[PDB]
């Protein structure tokens, strides 16, 4: 017969329906776990491309008509590309090349947020700083983050115990290397009983040449030790071997006696 034909009203898209994955390279990257970054309508043909571009994610189908989102499942960041810096949280691989900027064929690989406090960077930075690749800023900041024991996870704390033992066995061979000098500096900064005892052990296990070159303030000659008794002030205050000496290579007794000096004012 005569059906009452009626066409539906003209549709109006929303913000979700107008999203384009080829524009959200700065939105999907800072996404965390259990976060649904709605990427919008996605054709079936581009699903493989968006899945190979963001491998750390899962393409979850949220709504009809191809409406999908990307859900973070993992942080696939290598140690050399995530540990030797403190500002980079992600990078892009393309033709076997790491880049900071984005390329439409590149692949996003991101770093754990505050990865240094997870301890995963200890093994890489232990070898990267011990050598000619030693960056003063990066390695000093890494030692600082290591002594930040309260901001680390349980994995971080056990890796920190292991790192303490490893640095102790390393710096006992030679403390003149820059990484061990910064480790002694931060052990001074910590200023606990364990830290002072560790400094003392590290400096006592040093070789005779090292003691003769660096520890002439802690180990004085017999003439200077005899002369130091003729004055009431501690030896370290007037001793020229303590006036100009690397403060990181002093024993804790000497480091403290250097502060007990009375300054005439």
């Amino acid at each position, epitope marked *: 017969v005569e059906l009452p034909k009626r066409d539906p009203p003209p549709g109006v898209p929303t913000d979700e329906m107008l999203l384009n994955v080829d524009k959200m390279h700065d939105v999907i990257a800072p996404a965390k776990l259990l976060e649904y970054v709605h990427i919008g309508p996605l054709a079936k043909d581009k699903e493989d491309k968006v899945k190979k571009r963001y491998p750390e994610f899962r393409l979850v189908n949220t709504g009809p008509g191809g409406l999908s989102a990307l859900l973070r499942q993992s942080y696939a960041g290598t140690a050399p590309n995530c540990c030797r810096t403190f500002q980079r949280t992600h990078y892009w691989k393309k033709d076997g090349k790491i880049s900071d900027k984005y390329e439409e064929g590149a692949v996003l690989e991101s770093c754990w947020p505050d990865v240094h406090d997870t301890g995963k960077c200890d093994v890489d930075l232990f070898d990267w700083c011990q050598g000619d690749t030693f960056d003063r800023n990066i390695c000093h900041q890494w030692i600082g983050s290591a002594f930040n024991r309260a901001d680390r996870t349980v994995e971080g704390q056990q890796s920190l115990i292991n790192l303490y033992n490893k640095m102790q066995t390393l710096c006992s061979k030679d403390a003149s290397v820059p990484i061990c000098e910064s480790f002694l500096h931060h052990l001074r900064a910590h200023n606990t009983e364990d830290s002072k005892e560790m400094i003392d052990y590290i400096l006592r296990q040093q070789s005779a040449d090292f003691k003769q070159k660096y520890m002439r303030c802690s180990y004085p000659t017999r003439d200077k*030790l005899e002369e130091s008794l003729k004055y*009431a002030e501690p030896r370290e205050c007037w001793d020229p071997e303590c006036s100009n000496a690397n403060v990181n290579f002093l024993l804790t007794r000497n480091y403290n006696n250097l502060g007990l000096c009375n300054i005439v004012r």
Partner: nanobody
Amino acid sequence: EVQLQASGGGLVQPGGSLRLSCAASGIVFSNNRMSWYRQAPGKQREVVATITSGGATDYQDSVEGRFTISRDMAKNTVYLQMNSLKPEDTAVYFCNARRDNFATAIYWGQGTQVTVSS
């Protein structure tokens, strides 16, 4: 009239420890640098340890870390704790007191024998 009688010495095997004591009677530690000397038969005396009017301690490099010079102000007694004693440490250990700025007030005390037998 000034009493610096050292005591506590004796015979110990290598590695052993000894606590030497020197109780002053006529000298206040708040005015004097207190030193422990030793003298071995055949050689001259040498400073083993010292502590200023304040708790600032200093040690000879040969005995650094093995010896600890302590001070008790209420009892007015200076101690020397000797750990990991070696045969090189066999000597007569005695007390010494130098006034802070009087200089000429250098008082010595009777010694005590310390022997190590390998």
